[PDB]
Design a binder for these strands. Structure first.
Ligand SMILES: [Mg+2]
Ligand SMILES: [Mg+2]
Ligand SMILES: [Mg+2]
Ligand SMILES: [Mg+2]
Ligand SMILES: [Mg+2]
Ligand SMILES: [Mg+2]
Ligand SMILES: [Mg+2]
Ligand SMILES: [Mg+2]
Ligand SMILES: [Mg+2]
Ligand SMILES: [Mg+2]
Ligand SMILES: [Mg+2]
Ligand SMILES: [Mg+2]
Ligand SMILES: [Mg+2]
Ligand SMILES: [Mg+2]
Ligand SMILES: [Mg+2]
Ligand SMILES: [Mg+2]
Ligand SMILES: [Mg+2]
Ligand SMILES: [Mg+2]
Ligand SMILES: [Mg+2]
Ligand SMILES: [Mg+2]
Lengths: 60, 143, 70, 141, 145, 206, 63, 55, 67, 80
RNA sequence: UAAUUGCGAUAACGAACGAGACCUUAACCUACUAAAUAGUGGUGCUAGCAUUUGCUGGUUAUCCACUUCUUAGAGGGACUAUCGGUUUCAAGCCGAUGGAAGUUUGAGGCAAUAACAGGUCUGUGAUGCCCUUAGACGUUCUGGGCCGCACGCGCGCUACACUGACGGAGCCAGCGAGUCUAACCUUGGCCGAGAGGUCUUGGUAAUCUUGUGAAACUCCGUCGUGCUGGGGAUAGAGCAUUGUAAUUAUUGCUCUUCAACGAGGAAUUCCUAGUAAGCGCAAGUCAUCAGCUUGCGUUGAUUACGUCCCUGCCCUUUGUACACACC
């Protein structure tokens, strides 16, 4: 959870009110043992605006 | 029965092992000891004067016996308390790396510790040995 | 500076003859008998325990407690 | 394997995990006798369930506990908890209901929340003070 | 540690390094009434002079007392480091001193004067009776002088 | 009592006094009775305890404060004046010492002596400021049992604290001292004096 | 000195402009069958026992 | 320069310390105008046509 | 204070009006009823409601309730 | 080539805050009587079948002293 | 009732905004779906102590199984439930039991209509008008200044010690944050009294720093009521770090110097439970500088659970020649 805590006021007068915004980052990972074809088939599709997909290979 | 050091209270053990290293003679004490302070977060030297370097060795041993590996950096943090910044608020402060790095070096020469891979210092096999023996000694003082 | 700080022979003797009838003995008690500063009072405690008069019922630092032997 | 149950306890953010398997009556915390466990002035807090329910009872079992989190009092109230919960879990699956229920009766009738974790939890601070309720000093003029 | 006895050996109050020292005080701290010897300096000096710290200032054999000074006024020969010392790198002979007793007064004097004499702002600042380590002088320090 | 031994072993005096009676640091809860009617209800004693620590939820309701074991109320009250807020381990120990000390003097369940000094120092009646037109006299009142216990706990522990301040007697002795003298009010105790004076003035305006 | 014990049999409410004071009707135990209304200083519920330092004198309001 | 600065008597703490303090040092907020906040100074005025022509 | 808003008290009325057979002195089953027989957007609001349609039912069994 | 733009009409601009604010802008900047401007915005939004809608105009129009208005219609909620 | 929250009375009946609902976080799941970036038991390989099987560890894969502890998806759970007391036996309030939980469950987010000549043109390439515009009020470069000290006022930090200071020893959190076209978070090894230095190293992170071994705290000692070893202002002399730059001393270390302060007049602030208070930490700022803040966890009370006395506000009634509304 990314907090940002700012005074509400552009200037300085007033009782000092504070207001924290937050951005929630959800991360996930699924391990697959598969041939070459399905990997590409399954990564070009299943795309989605707002979801970040990353595919690493290898045991290291 | 059969024994560990974990079977023995900290002060009983460490003061027992302290006396031991003392009662022994085999050591390697720096020599700046007696003029030195143990942390800049401190105010006076140790009051044990002659000795105390045995207390930390015995303590340092036991700490490393109790776990995988530990470096000077960890023990500098372990050992250092709050420093009065005079009129400014207390901050935690790390202790002295010289005391500890030389405690680690001395214990190794005496073969109670060894330069573990991954980093730091692991208890030695011959440390497991002797420590479990004096722990066994101290439980016996209450037979 | 108001005296309690050394051992003036009569003192030692006072400490051996007077500690009976002490149902309670501790640092603060030894000081309160117009003598001994906390330091040599603490030394006295260990040494009156060398044998008799005082029985160790309490443990530790900050607080001692003793009773007449029986 | 033998008969074995694992249980836990919490107080503030301490969480004490027990493993109560069938054995010859040991009681160890992290890796030391339950007779050590200092903060010391509290030691009888963790002996407590043992004496509450009869110092025998443990002859058929082994108990190990590992606490992480919380602090030097939190961890005591957590470990005693998981200990007594572990005793009642074991009878629950292995001994018998009366035995178990007798055991809950003992703990509760005494209780310092031995079987039941305390919901008390830190309240969030809010701007305008160093605490949750406390407020910064003001002046008017 | 022990119950001791002693005859009339120890004397209350003893004089050394040109100043007076209370006898019925632990010798480490008893020494500190001397200017230029703080707790650390005293502690180490006694250790070096092979004296029993457990002792009062009053006990101390005159030979011990003689040693305790000797080291105080030549800390470098008796292997006290130098970072331990209140006047490394003089500024004239550039040696390393530890200035003691009635003498720290003259050196504070000397140093204050060297600044003023050379007209350096710090010195001017001293001559004016102001704060010189650059602290804010609006609100703080108003009784004083 | 039949000793029982298992793998990692429990000490005899621990096995002993425990499984048998459920008594204090090692002091009897049995006997120990409240010599003043009332106060029974607002002085605990039974169910008995090992030490005066407890994750107790005595706050969230008006009177349940009373169900707290009186000894632990006594200790709770030791831990104040800013520098010592929290610090129950500090406090608990002081009590353990105090009770030991008290026992040395004049025998008696030391926990009973505590009971006595409480009962003995709570103002039977008191005073409150009543308007009555600027110049406000002092209308007398009888005071609650609860307020009688509270006040007595506070009175005791405060006098001990100040007596303890700036002097060689340790905090545990002054506490014990106050208690002892207050167990049968010897007017040389800070608490009694105030109790006696508080009832002096209440009486003086009825 | 005579003591005089009276058990609180009813809670009447608060008086005293501040409001710290509580009116209450009590009943003696040593010879019951007679009741008096008193003003308490601390917190109070039913069945508690006031040590009336003197026995015959009740109040009403408080300013 | 600096030479003047140390030489200048009539300077440093001692000389101030021995001077009485102005009373402006212990004054007030001064405020000046605040209970005239609502009484517009501009002398001007909108008019009902121009406001109606706008809103 | 636990005084129930009108939305809750109103919905109980409406339910007890037209499903009095079914509905019982028991909240737990009154709960389940409210799902099958009414649409409510939050578990909390439904619980709130069913707990009070229960209350109203419990005292109906002992004389009428106006409304 | 590694970046690509596509236009898209919007399904009824009538339910779009941003579209309708920009309408007021273009309404007023084109010389429309404030009330005419805001109502037409309100009534066209409603006519696109909104549940409700509200227009505030704040600032100075022709008179020196600044003012404000609320032009609302239909149903709105304001919290949670 | 926290609430124009409801009951009830009733020329009203039935509704909508705001309140509530809703949302976020903290609490409960041995029920669900799982996990070598979390962890348990077993098994090997293995060290120590005992030896009678035991006890305590090592081994980012030597294999097998599991999901209690951790993580976060989907559900479930509480509705002041059951019982009782009280009450116009109405809304409700009170106690007892059960319960993870029964003070709006605890703490927040959001929040109608309306008012103020509240503050902000010094956040904005938001802006009207006025001013200025080449000897500039544009801009940039060098240097100084915002820190200047008879003194008044406010938020604070550290303290007046023995529930303590000091010295050894025990030794436990939670919220966080970190380096690409860069030099951020730093374990480990050496050197150094320290501050720090140096050689390497892991980490774009549940993977490494980090179990952030934090501080109060706990234990054993020294000191022993003495402005003392409480207190650490002021000042001298030296060593280093950030930076192009440290003088008016950025900060860090070391020795020395060792002030006021002995609980604070009139006054005045804040607060009801994991709260007050004590205690430290991460984050913001940040090249370097926290005695500040935003949060976090640790230790953990006393006393109310009431009222209208003070003070502040709200509501009725009532007066008005006010309506630009007592400025
Ligand atoms: Mg530490
Ligand atoms: Mg330490
Ligand atoms: Mg000196
Ligand atoms: Mg300053
Ligand atoms: Mg402090
Ligand atoms: Mg709404
Ligand atoms: Mg809301
Ligand atoms: Mg699970
Ligand atoms: Mg209950
Ligand atoms: Mg204005
Ligand atoms: Mg602006
Ligand atoms: Mg400024
Ligand atoms: Mg402020
Ligand atoms: Mg300490
Ligand atoms: Mg060097
Ligand atoms: Mg790399
Ligand atoms: Mg001093
Ligand atoms: Mg100091
Ligand atoms: Mg910072
Ligand atoms: Mg700031």
């Amino acid at each position: 959870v990314l907090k940002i805590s700012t005074r509400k006021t552009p200037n300085g007068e007033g009782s000092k009110t504070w207001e924290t915004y937050e951005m929630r980052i959800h991360k996930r990972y699924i391990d697959l043992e598969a041939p070459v074809q399905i990997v590409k088939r399954i990564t070009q599709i299943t795309i989605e605006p707002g979801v970040d997909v990353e595919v690493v290979v290898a045991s290291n | 029965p059969g024994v560990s050091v974990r079977d023995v209270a900290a002060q009983d053990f460490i003061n027992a092992y302290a006396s031991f290293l003392q009662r022994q003679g085999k050591l390697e004490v720096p020599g700046y000891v007696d003029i030195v302070k143990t942390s800049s977060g401190n105010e006076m030297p140790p009051q044990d004067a002659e000795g105390w370097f045995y207390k930390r060795a015995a303590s340092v041993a036991r700490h490393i016996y109790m776990r995988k590996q530990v470096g000077v950096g960890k023990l500098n943090k372990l050992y250092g308390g709050a420093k009065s910044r005079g009129v400014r608020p207390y901050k935690h402060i790390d202790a002295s790396g010289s005391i500890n790095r030389k405690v680690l070096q001395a214990l190794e020469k005496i073969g109670i510790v060894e330069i573990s891979p991954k980093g730091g210092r692991r208890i030695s096999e011959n440390g497991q040995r002797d420590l479990d023996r004096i722990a066994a000694q101290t439980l016996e003082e209450d037979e | 500076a108001q005296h309690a700080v050394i051992l003036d022979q009569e003192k030692y003797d006072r400490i051996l003859k007077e500690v009976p009838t002490y149902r309670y003995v501790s640092v603060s008690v030894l000081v309160d008998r117009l003598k001994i500063g906390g330091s040599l009072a603490r030394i006295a405690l260990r040494h009156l325990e060398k044998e008799g008069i005082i029985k160790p019922i309490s443990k530790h630092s900050k607080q001692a407690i003793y009773t007449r032997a029986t | 394997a033998v008969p074995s149950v694992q249980t836990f306890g919490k107080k503030k953010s301490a969480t004490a995990v027990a493993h109560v398997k069938a054995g010859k009556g040991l009681i160890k915390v992290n890796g030391s006798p339950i007779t050590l466990v200092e903060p010391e002035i509290l030691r009888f807090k963790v002996y407590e369930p043992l004496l509450l329910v009869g110092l025998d009872k443990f002859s058929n079992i082994d108990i190990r506990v590992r606490v992480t989190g919380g602090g030097h009092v939190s961890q005591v109230y957590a470990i005693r908890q998981a200990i007594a919960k572990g005793l009642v879990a074991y009878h629950q699956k292995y001994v018998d209901e009366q035995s178990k229920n007798e055991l809950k009766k003992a703990f509760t009738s005494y209780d310092r929340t031995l079987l039941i974790a305390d919901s008390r939890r830190p309240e969030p601070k809010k701007f305008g003070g160093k605490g949750a309720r406390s407020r910064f000093q003001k002046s008017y003029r | 540690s022990l119950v001791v006895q002693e005859q009339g050996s120890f004397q209350h109050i003893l004089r050394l390094l040109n100043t007076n020292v209370d006898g019925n005080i632990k010798i480490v701290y008893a020494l500190t009434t001397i200017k230029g010897v703080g707790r650390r300096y005293s502690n180490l000096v006694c250790k070096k002079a092979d004296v029993d710290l457990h002792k009062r200032a009053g006990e101390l054999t005159q030979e011990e007392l003689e040693r305790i000074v000797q080291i105080m006024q030549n800390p470098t020969h008796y292997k006290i480091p130098a970072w331990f010392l209140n006047r490394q790198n003089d500024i004239t002979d550039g040696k390393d001193y530890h200035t003691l007793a009635n003498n720290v007064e003259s050196k504070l004097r000397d140093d204050l004067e060297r600044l003023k004499k050379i007209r350096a702002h710090r010195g001017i600042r001293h001559f004016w009776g102001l704060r010189v380590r650059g602290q804010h002088t609006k609100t703080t320090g108003r009784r004083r002088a | 009592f039949t000793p029982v031994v298992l793998a990692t072993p429990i000490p005899e005096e621990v096995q002993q006094a425990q499984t048998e009676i459920k008594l204090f640091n090692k002091w009897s809860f049995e006997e120990v009775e409240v010599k003043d009617a009332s106060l029974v209800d607002y002085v605990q004693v039974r169910q008995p305890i090992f030490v005066a620590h407890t994750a107790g939820r005595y706050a969230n309701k008006r009177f349940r404060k009373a169900q707290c074991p009186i000894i632990e109320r006594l200790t709770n009250s030791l831990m104040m004046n800013g520098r010592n807020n929290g610090k129950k381990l500090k406090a608990v120990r002081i009590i353990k010492h105090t009770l030991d000390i008290i026992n040395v003097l004049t025998d008696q369940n030391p926990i009973q002596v505590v009971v006595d000094a409480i009962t003995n120092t709570g103002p039977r009646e008191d005073t409150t400021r009543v308007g009555g037109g600027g110049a406000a006299r002092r209308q007398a009142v009888d005071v609650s049992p609860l307020r009688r216990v509270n006040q007595a706990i506070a009175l005791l522990t405060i006098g001990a604290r100040e007596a303890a301040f700036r002097n060689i007697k340790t905090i545990a002795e002054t506490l014990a001292e106050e208690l002892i003298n207050a167990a049968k009010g010897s007017s040389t105790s800070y608490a009694i004096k105030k109790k006696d004076e508080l009832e002096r003035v209440a009486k003086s305006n009825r | 000195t005579p003591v005089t014990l009276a058990k609180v049999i009813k809670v009447l409410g608060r008086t005293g402009s501040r409001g710290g004071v509580t009116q209450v009707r009590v009943e003696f135990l040593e010879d019951t069958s007679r009741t008096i209304v008193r003003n308490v200083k601390g917190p109070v519920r039913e069945n508690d026992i006031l040590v009336l330092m003197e026995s015959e004198r009740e109040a009403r309001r408080l300013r | 320069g600096n030479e003047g600065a140390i030489r200048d008597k009539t300077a440093g703490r001692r000389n101030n310390r021995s001077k009485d303090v102005t009373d402006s040092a212990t004054t007030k907020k001064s405020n000046t105008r605040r209970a005239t906040d609502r009484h517009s100074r501009t002398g001007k005025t909108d008019t009902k046509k121009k406001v109606n022509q706008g809103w | 204070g636990r005084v129930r808003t009108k939305t809750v008290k109103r919905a109980s009325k409406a339910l007890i009006e037209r499903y009095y057979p079914k509905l019982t002195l028991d909240f737990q089953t009154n709960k389940r009823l409210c799902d099958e027989i009414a649409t409510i957007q939050s578990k909390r609001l439904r619980n709130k409601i069913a707990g009070y349609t229960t209350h109203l039912m419990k005292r109906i069994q002992k004389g009428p309730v106006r409304g | 080539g590694t970046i690509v733009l596509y236009a898209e009409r919007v399904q009824d601009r009538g339910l779009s805050a941003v579209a309708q604010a920009e309408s007021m802008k273009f309404k007023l900047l084109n010389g429309l009587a404030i009330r005419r401007a805001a109502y037409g915005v309100v009534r066209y939004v409603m006519e696109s079948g909104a549940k409700g809608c509200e227009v505030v105009v704040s600032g100075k129009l022709r008179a020196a002293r600044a003012k404000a208005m609320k032009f609302a219609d239909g149903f709105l909620i304001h919290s949670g």
